[PDB]
Design a protein around this ligand. Structure first.
Ligand SMILES: [Mg+2]
Length: 745
């Protein structure tokens, strides 16, 4: 078995290679060094400065440059002992700086060791290249092993979650967050792969359908972006259900924040959702015409980015898969026709060209596109038409038709296309749950795959939402950690409420006084309100009045929020519209009556076609509240997915790119946090082992251990605070271990 077999791929690909030497001796060297910046402008850069002279206060050190400087002792980023280079859990490090953390991540990454623990977290750095560690053979090795037993790995956290479920009869959760392209979705699929293996139907029908859902969701909710060729344009919470026996009984999927806008617009080089391209590459020459299908270059919705294909991707071939998956989960052939018809029609509606000329309102000179949409949708063109350009509107009394100009007409068409697509996605999800979900379930393991904090060039309503969710998840973490401590130091014999996250949280979601969303909702009821009134109202209530808010020196359309991960500047353009998310009623009417059986559902099912009516912000707050409650009932696990750089290249781990993520994701906080206490809390039989020699008394594997522990401390004649005697482990403060290991034989 590979765990013991230094020749196995397990050893190869998952562990830091070992030689038959054990020496605390081999390790040995005669000097002591540190972490510095060869230019304080760029601080994430650092070099190792050999300390040469010491004082009492500071420390002089030699540079890579050859030069020599001086630092404060209380400003020192002390380099851990080389022995530590590559440890599996950074919680093991003596000095817990930032460069110290990055260094260990890097040393590992240079060895292709992408997974590392950091206390509670499992850190995973995208390698941007394939690493064969996800085979069934790799699966098998993880089975039933403790975290301390095997190398860091997603499979590992998954197994721990599963045994805890079974053991504690407690539900579990895995929170997988981080930047686009960090490896969130990849890792999530592995979690499910692993679960399906260790808990499914021996070689499964359900298992396959559960497996087959992703690809259905991915064709519809995934798209190529500059950051990822297969970006998830929606968030999700996957619940894997089990019976009391521990076997998979079902599953359920919750989706969030689907990027509807992408349907009608994609940035340069980007792509619209995958399905569009698959549909047009894989339908038969015969389904096309049937759908009046042509090429992407012939569609407005697909010929604007300039990108219509992905390197290493066969849209026609990926379409088989999708269609296949639909078949497995159980989509009727006719259910499938309709899904494709919708996609097609949406493709047609974008092809509609409004012209003005005539007077002031828009007009449809050519009805080619219109007709085609109507056809495939199973709707009556003149109505659609009428609904698009001349929608009836209330004047309280007056239900009267308005004649839309070209732009207004266009936006409506767009609003229509977006509704169609989001409702469709909704339906797909429901339909899948319908098949997979269990009413009757004993336990569950839930997997949250959603982005981490979003701080772009342009931050809008959607970034606020994701950011809000992130503040809550970050608060959950901190709290959790706080608790894992409160009752627990009180386990191995150790000593000794309000969140800093609350204010930010309150600023956004508070009811009284009203926070951003409430005022946003308020402004939403007045039809005649604007981005300006809105932004005016926010500044009015929070400028110089709320500490987490900032009114810009100059911009009149943005505001800043001091988030966990730092300040984020938001722009309010279109927020009223986004909050209401309007669709002309006649449009609804047009479609409520549709030949198409799938279409009817989208407009006829209040579960699909309607919000509550609550606002988009109200609904978001609500679903965020439901999600957390659930989480609150689980034993959680945190995975931090990191991109090594912004270029999608392997072998390029950029200190700035990385640290920034470490800063924003809570990895850096937790560290410094325990940093304060007693992080190093070693095992007795574990210290005397590597440290029986540095003491003229102590021998290797003995019985009276904690006593033996006393020895070296004695021989080493150490002080009452750098260390702590705790029933099981010897708690060591920071650098205690460094210095210690830093002694002679
Ligand atoms: Mg993803």
């Amino acid at each position: 078995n590979p765990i013991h077999d230094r020749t196995s791929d397990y050893h190869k690909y998952l562990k830091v290679k070992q030689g038959d030497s054990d020496l605390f001796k081999l390790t040995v060297s005669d000097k002591r060094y540190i972490w510095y910046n060869p230019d304080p402008k760029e601080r994430d850069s650092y070099e190792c400065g050999e300390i040469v002279s010491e004082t009492s206060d500071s420390f002089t050190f030699k540079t890579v440059d050859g030069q020599d400087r001086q630092v404060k002792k209380d400003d020192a980023n002390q380099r851990n002992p080389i022995k530590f280079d590559g440890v599996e859990d950074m919680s093991e490090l003596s000095y817990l700086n930032e460069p110290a953390v990055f260094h260990n991540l890097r040393v590992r990454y240079n060895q292709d060791l992408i997974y590392t623990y950091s206390g509670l977290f499992l850190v995973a750095v995208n390698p941007f290249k394939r690493i064969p560690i996800y085979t069934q053979e790799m699966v098998d090795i993880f089975k039933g092993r403790r975290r301390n037993e095997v190398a860091p790995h997603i499979f590992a956290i998954s197994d721990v979650a599963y045994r805890s479920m079974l053991d504690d009869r407690q539900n579990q959760s895995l929170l997988i967050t981080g930047e686009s392209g960090a490896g969130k979705t990849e890792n999530t699929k592995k979690v499910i792969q692993y679960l399906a293996s260790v808990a499914g139907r021996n070689q499964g029908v359900l298992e396959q359908q559960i497996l087959q859902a992703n690809p259905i969701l991915e064709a519809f909710g995934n798209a190529k972006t500059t950051r990822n060729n297969n970006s998830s344009r929606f968030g999700k919470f996957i619940e894997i259900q089990f019976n009391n026996a521990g076997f998979i009984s079902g599953a359920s999927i919750q989706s969030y924040l689907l990027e509807k806008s992408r349907v009608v617009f994609q940035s340069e080089t980007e792509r619209n959702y995958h399905i569009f391209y698959q549909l047009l590459a894989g339908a038969t020459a015969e389904e096309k015409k049937a759908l009046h299908l042509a090429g992407p270059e012939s569609f407005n919705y697909l010929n604007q980015s300039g990108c219509v294909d992905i390197k290493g991707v066969s849209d026609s071939e990926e379409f088989k898969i999708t269609r296949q998956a639909m078949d497995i989960v159980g989509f009727s052939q006719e259910e499938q026709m309709s899904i494709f018809k919708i996609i097609a029609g949406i493709l047609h509606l974008g092809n509609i060209k409004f012209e003005k000329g005539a007077g002031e309102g828009a007009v449809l000179k050519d009805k080619t596109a219109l007709n085609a949409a109507s056809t495939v949708f199973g709707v009556n063109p003149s109505v659609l038409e009428k609904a698009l350009m001349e929608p009836r509107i209330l004047a309280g009394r007056d239900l009267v038709a308005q004649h839309l100009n070209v732009e207004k007409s266009s936006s409506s068409r767009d609003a229509l296309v977006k509704a169609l697509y989001g409702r469709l996605f909704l339906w797909l999800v429901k339909k899948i749950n319908n098949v997979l979900c269990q009413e009757r379930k004993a336990y569950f393991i839930g997997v949250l795959d959603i982005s981490g904090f979003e701080i772009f060039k342009v931050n809008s309503f959607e970034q606020l939402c994701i950011n809000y969710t992130n503040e809550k998840l970050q608060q959950f973490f901190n709290h959790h950690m706080f608790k894992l401590e409160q009752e627990e130091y009180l386990k191995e014999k150790i000593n000794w409420f309000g969140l800093d996250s609350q204010a930010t949280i309150d600023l956004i979601d508070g009811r009284q006084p009203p926070g951003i969303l409430a005022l946003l909702d308020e402004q939403s009821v007045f039809p005649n309100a604007t981005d300006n009134t809105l932004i005016t109202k926010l500044h009015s209530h929070f400028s110089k009045k709320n500490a987490k808010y900032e009114e810009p020196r100059f911009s009149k359309t943005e505001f800043g929020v001091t988030h966990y991960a730092g300040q984020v500047m938001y722009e309010i353009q279109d927020w009223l519209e986004k909050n209401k998310d309007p669709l002309q009623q006649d449009l609804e009417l047009c479609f409520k009556d549709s030949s198409d059986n799938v279409v009817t559902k989208l407009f006829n099912d209040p579960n699909i076609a309607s919000r509550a009516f609550i606002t988009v912000a109200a609904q978001y707050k609500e679903q965020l509240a439901s999600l957390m409650a659930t989480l609150e009932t689980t034993n959680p696990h945190f995975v931090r997915c990191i991109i090594p750089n912004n270029k999608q290249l392997p072998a390029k781990l950029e200190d700035k790119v990385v640290l920034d993520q470490l800063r924003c994701n809570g990895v850096l906080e937790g560290i410094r946090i325990t940093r304060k206490g007693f992080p190093n809390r070693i095992i007795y039989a574990d210290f005397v082992k590597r440290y029986y020699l540095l003491a003229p008394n102590v021998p290797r594997d003995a019985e009276d251990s904690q006593k033996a522990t006393d020895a070296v401390l004695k021989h080493l004649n150490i002080d009452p605070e750098q260390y702590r005697f705790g029933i099981t482990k010897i708690f060591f403060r920071a650098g205690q271990l460094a210095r210690i290991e830093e002694a002679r034989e």
